[PDB]
Design an enzyme around this catalytic site. Structure first.
Site, short mmCIF file in Angstrom:
data_model
loop_
_atom_site.label_atom_id
_atom_site.label_comp_id
_atom_site.label_asym_id
_atom_site.label_seq_id
_atom_site.Cartn_x
_atom_site.Cartn_y
_atom_site.Cartn_z
N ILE B 12 21.51 88.65 -15.07
CA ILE B 12 20.41 89.33 -14.38
C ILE B 12 20.91 90.61 -13.70
CG2 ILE B 12 18.61 89.16 -12.59
CD1 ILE B 12 18.13 87.53 -15.26
N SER B 119 17.15 87.39 -6.97
CA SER B 119 16.85 87.31 -8.40
C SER B 119 16.46 85.90 -8.85
CB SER B 119 18.05 87.78 -9.23
OG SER B 119 19.04 86.77 -9.32
N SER B 149 11.31 83.00 -10.48
CA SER B 149 12.13 82.74 -11.66
C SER B 149 11.56 83.45 -12.88
CB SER B 149 12.24 81.23 -11.92
OG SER B 149 10.98 80.66 -12.21
N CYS B 150 12.21 83.25 -14.03
CA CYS B 150 11.76 83.81 -15.30
C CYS B 150 10.48 83.14 -15.79
CB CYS B 150 12.86 83.66 -16.36
SG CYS B 150 13.44 81.96 -16.59
N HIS B 177 12.94 76.76 -23.57
CA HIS B 177 13.70 77.78 -22.87
C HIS B 177 15.11 77.97 -23.41
CE1 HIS B 177 15.49 80.17 -19.73
NE2 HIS B 177 14.38 80.17 -19.00
N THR B 180 21.32 78.73 -20.64
CA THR B 180 21.81 79.67 -19.62
C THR B 180 23.22 79.36 -19.12
OG1 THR B 180 20.31 78.44 -18.14
CG2 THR B 180 19.66 80.68 -18.75
N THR B 210 12.17 72.00 -13.79
CA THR B 210 11.89 73.39 -13.39
C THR B 210 10.72 73.50 -12.42
OG1 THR B 210 11.28 75.63 -14.18
CG2 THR B 210 10.64 73.77 -15.58
N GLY B 211 10.92 74.25 -11.34
CA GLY B 211 9.92 74.40 -10.29
C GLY B 211 8.93 75.54 -10.50
N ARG B 233 15.56 72.99 -22.92
CA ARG B 233 16.65 73.91 -23.22
C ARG B 233 17.07 73.79 -24.68
NH1 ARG B 233 18.01 76.76 -18.13
NH2 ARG B 233 15.77 76.73 -17.64
N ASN B 315 13.73 85.61 -20.88
CA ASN B 315 14.16 85.16 -19.55
C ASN B 315 15.18 86.08 -18.89
OD1 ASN B 315 16.87 83.47 -20.49
ND2 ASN B 315 15.15 83.26 -21.92
N1 LIG Z 1 19.77 84.03 -16.81
C1 LIG Z 1 18.44 83.94 -16.74
O1 LIG Z 1 17.70 83.94 -17.92
C2 LIG Z 1 17.74 83.89 -15.41
C3 LIG Z 1 16.43 84.34 -15.31
C4 LIG Z 1 15.85 84.56 -14.05
C5 LIG Z 1 16.58 84.29 -12.89
N2 LIG Z 1 17.86 83.81 -13.00
C6 LIG Z 1 18.60 83.55 -11.75
O2 LIG Z 1 19.53 84.59 -11.47
C7 LIG Z 1 20.70 84.15 -10.80
C8 LIG Z 1 21.95 84.58 -11.62
O3 LIG Z 1 21.74 84.28 -12.99
P1 LIG Z 1 22.67 84.68 -14.22
O4 LIG Z 1 22.10 84.12 -15.48
O5 LIG Z 1 22.81 86.12 -14.08
O6 LIG Z 1 24.01 83.84 -13.91
P2 LIG Z 1 25.52 84.37 -14.15
O7 LIG Z 1 26.57 83.29 -14.04
O8 LIG Z 1 25.60 85.35 -15.24
O9 LIG Z 1 25.73 85.25 -12.85
C9 LIG Z 1 26.53 84.72 -11.85
C10 LIG Z 1 27.27 85.95 -11.42
O10 LIG Z 1 27.44 85.93 -10.03
C11 LIG Z 1 28.84 85.91 -9.73
N3 LIG Z 1 29.06 85.17 -8.49
C12 LIG Z 1 29.02 83.79 -8.32
N4 LIG Z 1 29.28 83.53 -7.01
C13 LIG Z 1 29.47 84.72 -6.36
C14 LIG Z 1 29.76 85.05 -5.04
N5 LIG Z 1 29.36 84.23 -4.07
N6 LIG Z 1 29.90 86.37 -4.68
C15 LIG Z 1 29.76 87.37 -5.62
N7 LIG Z 1 29.48 87.02 -6.91
C16 LIG Z 1 29.33 85.74 -7.28
C17 LIG Z 1 29.47 85.26 -10.93
O11 LIG Z 1 30.81 85.61 -11.12
C18 LIG Z 1 28.63 85.86 -12.03
O12 LIG Z 1 29.03 87.15 -12.38
C19 LIG Z 1 20.43 82.64 -10.69
O13 LIG Z 1 19.79 82.40 -9.47
C20 LIG Z 1 19.45 82.31 -11.81
O14 LIG Z 1 18.66 81.15 -11.67
C21 LIG Z 1 18.46 83.63 -14.23
#
Ligand SMILES: NC(=O)c1ccc[n+]([C@@H]2O[C@H](COP(=O)([O-])OP(=O)(O)OC[C@H]3O[C@@H](n4cnc5c(N)ncnc54)[C@H](O)[C@@H]3O)[C@@H](O)[C@H]2O)c1
Ligand SMILES: NC(=O)c1ccc[n+]([C@@H]2O[C@H](COP(=O)([O-])OP(=O)(O)OC[C@H]3O[C@@H](n4cnc5c(N)ncnc54)[C@H](O)[C@@H]3O)[C@@H](O)[C@H]2O)c1
Lengths: 336, 334
Positions: B12, B119, B149-150, B177, B180, B210-211, B233, B315
């Site tokens: 994201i 996000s 969320s997405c 979905h 992830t 999922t909420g 999933r 998503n």
């Molecule tokens: N991937 C999707 O399709 C999707 C869609 C909508 C929302 N989200 C939400 O977005 C958020 C991130 O999702 P993602 O898919 O990008 O996951 P992801 O694992 O790609 O991103 C996690 C990132 O955050 C970093 N990170 C973890 N802990 C950290 C810390 N405390 N300090 C700094 N960086 C830190 C990790 O190294 C990684 O780069 C989640 O809350 C997820 O539910 C995801």
């Protein structure tokens, strides 16, 4: 003595119908027909991507091939009418090609000399459609042609029955998250049936597609005829699928506990019950025609109105095969 | 220009960076993760599903450079110790997954930043925003915000049209979905003890909770408690579909009524299609939701009806487009 079975179309269901009949007494596969030679058949029987190495020993000989000591005459006649059924004294043909899914069409096996035919798919025309342990009793003996229904019908039917028998099904919609099949394309390509979605790459996509299973349920459970509809989403797993059924019931104040407990009371060899949190790959090779996953049972209630969601697993390959061979072996033992 | 620092340069977070590169008056000035810059630049340049990033990237001192603009790199788990005041950060885009709560996210404020946009769905007393569905709720006084969320962003518009035009009675949801990063590659013990996500993501149909549907009253308060449901999933890296099975107030409902009512409410966020598309046809689409009109199905047994619809959504990108959309509006209220 043993009932003589010929498997027409030695593909996924044909090969698995074969593996299943090895461990069934008084049921013997004497003939196998396809569009390829013995060498390919023997090999595709030996090795299975999703299902695993054939337990016994497949060895290729003249004409057909020997499995665990015994010979199976193999053929490659595309025209079922031209197969030597009467000469071989075939009692039942397992129609697994997917090209004879009609009563009049499948008559070519009977024209060829077979006594009975069981099609491994839903079939058009005047015939009984049999999900085992749900309506195999409607089989009496007179039948020449029978339909083994779809994989989804076998997953849906026993949950569909418990729902109406115990709660009174007003109406319902069904969507099945399904594994990809042979009829789908490996890559973006023109499709044989003109379907623009089955035209798409099966292993890199979520693909919507229509299925009769829900709309055709009246053939199996007549009392719920025209209460169910819905389709399928086809996802990148090679086998194993899940049916989701969202329903409206006559009984009000229905609880989650009730629905699950009612399914556990109706569990047999065909309709399984699980409370474990399993995934699609956990059902690969299972012999339950339908496995009710109790953890996916959900009930929405805004006042005195309810929606009831349930889910049943099925290895569309083995699960269906187990039911088909069951339906087959019963139909055969009904002849004397 | 509004000074933005991204916390959590993930799927994201990185796509958010690409998305902002074309929103004027919005400049990404800093980025914080858990890895070194050599890595941070590489994952920006190269995306598996989304594609080679179009700008040009270089690794520099204390950060990395994108199209001449210099982004400051940091790696502080404790979001408390970030120089947000030093940099005059106006909004922090929170995309780690570890500050998905109001009291938790008040660390970026402590750090020196003025606002935070999460996000993800977040606990605590804060506004949950689906763009073009209720971003107007934000008046500017907010210190911490959630971008939902997405699946919430795919669901919201479809649901509003359903309630406002036909009257929502109750309904259930299945979301087929994409898998992830929180899922495992191999069957292995799960961080949060989820036996289903503990499984090899790319080789299973994994049902998960999922909420999105349950907590829909946060975005559409008139329809709270009316929706519920789950996820499935499946082994696609990106692209998802929301399936809604609803009971409606209006009678003798036609499929063609539903599709026409959905084409009428279509916009920048809520697309409308009649082509028989599949998962991959939405990879990188900037619609937060795309209503598939081929998937509308209506069951009627006498006077009693069940209506089903399906909405496509990337998503990753569908959410990001919506999240960055919300970021700009939240920013222009300063
Ligand atoms: N991937 C999707 O399709 C999707 C869609 C909508 C929302 N989200 C939400 O977005 C958020 C991130 O999702 P993602 O898919 O990008 O996951 P992801 O694992 O790609 O991103 C996690 C990132 O955050 C970093 N990170 C973890 N802990 C950290 C810390 N405390 N300090 C700094 N960086 C830190 C990790 O190294 C990684 O780069 C989640 O809350 C997820 O539910 C995801
Ligand atoms: N695969 C499943 O999960 C599934 C489940 C239940 C029912 N079915 C039904 O079973 C039938 C076969 O399914 P499958 O998955 O085994 O497909 P498949 O392609 O593996 O089987 C087709 C086989 O039949 C052979 N064949 C085609 N035309 C022939 C001809 N006229 N004469 C002799 N052989 C011919 C093909 O070479 C191939 O070996 C279809 O009706 C299908 O809908 C499939």
């Amino acid at each position: 003595m043993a009932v003589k079975v010929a498997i027409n179309g030695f593909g996924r269901i044909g090969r698995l119908a074969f593996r299943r009949i090895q461990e069934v007494e008084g049921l013997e596969v004497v003939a196998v027909n396809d569009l390829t030679d013995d060498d390919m058949l023997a090999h595709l029987l030996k090795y299975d991507t999703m299902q695993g190495r054939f337990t016994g020993e497949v060895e290729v000989v003249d004409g057909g091939f020997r499995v665990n000591g015994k010979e199976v005459k193999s053929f490659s006649e595309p025209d079922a009418s031209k197969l030597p059924w009467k000469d071989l004294n075939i009692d039942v043909v397992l129609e697994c090609t997917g090209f004879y899914t009609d009563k009049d069409k499948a008559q070519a096996h009977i024209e060829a000399g077979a006594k009975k035919v069981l099609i491994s798919a839903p079939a058009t025309g005047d015939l009984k459609t049999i999900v085992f342990n749900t309506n195999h009793q409607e089989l009496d003996g007179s039948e020449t042609v029978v339909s083994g229904a779809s994989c989804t019908t076998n997953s849906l039917a026993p949950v569909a029955k418990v729902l109406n028998d115990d709660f009174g099904l007003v109406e319902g919609l069904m969507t099945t998250i399904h594994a990809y099949t042979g009829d789908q394309n490996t890559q973006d390509a023109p499709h044989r049936k003109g379907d623009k979605r089955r035209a798409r790459a099966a292993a890199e996509n979520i693909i919507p597609n229509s299925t009769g299973a829900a709309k055709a349920i009246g053939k199996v459970i007549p009392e719920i005829d025209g209460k169910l509809d819905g389709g399928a989403q086809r996802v990148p797993v090679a086998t194993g699928s899940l049916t989701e059924l969202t329903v409206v019931l006559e009984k009000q104040d229905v609880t989650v506990e009730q629905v699950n407990e009612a399914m556990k009371n109706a569990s047999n060899e065909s309709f399984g019950y699980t409370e474990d949190e399993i995934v699609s790959s956990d059902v690969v090779g299972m012999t339950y025609g339908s496995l009710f996953d109790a953890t996916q049972t959900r009930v929405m209630s805004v006042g005195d109105r309810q929606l009831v969601k349930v889910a049943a697993w099925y290895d569309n390959e083995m699960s269906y095969t187990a039911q088909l061979v069951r339906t087959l072996a019963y139909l055969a033992e009904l002849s004397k």
